[PDB]
Amino acid sequence: DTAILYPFTISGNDRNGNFTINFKGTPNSTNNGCIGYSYNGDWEKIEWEGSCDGNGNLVVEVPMSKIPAGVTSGEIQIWWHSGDLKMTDYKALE
Ligand SMILES: OC[C@H]1O[C@@H](O[C@H]2[C@H](O)[C@@H](O)[C@H](O[C@H]3[C@H](O)[C@@H](O)[C@H](O)O[C@@H]3CO)O[C@@H]2CO)[C@H](O)[C@@H](O)[C@@H]1O
Secondary structure (H helix, E strand, C coil), rough: CEEEEEEECCCCCCCCCCEEEEECCCCCEEEEEEEEEEEEEEEEEEEEEEEEECCEEEEEEEHHHHHHCCCCCCEEEEEECCCCEEEEEEEEEE
8 A cells, every 4th residue: 555754854964873763563564665865856765674573663774874965854665564564763873
């Protein structure tokens, strides 16, 4: 079914560590999606995928260095979720 989009905001200048996204979902599910943002007038996507563990938790990490400096916002997208999946929270962490 339908893609789920979550607007995010980050530092435009701090590129230390990892964009860290926590999802809660059906235990043992498969899921995938992206982080999407505009840079230089163009839409760019960094894909993620992962399975929820036995507790229904999924942590996705994307290194910050993959996102150009000067980008401060975009969308976390869920594309495929075998069961249920929600994004509970995100931040840049080291
Ligand atoms: O095929 C993968 C999935 O694609 C989903 O569509 C998303 C596109 O992949 C994504 O590029 C597009 O991005 C938008 C963004 O949401 C918007 O704010 C910006 O203004 O423009 C971008 C488009 O250039 O978002 C869509 C989600 O709406 C499908 O919905 C999904 O079924 C499919 O698996």
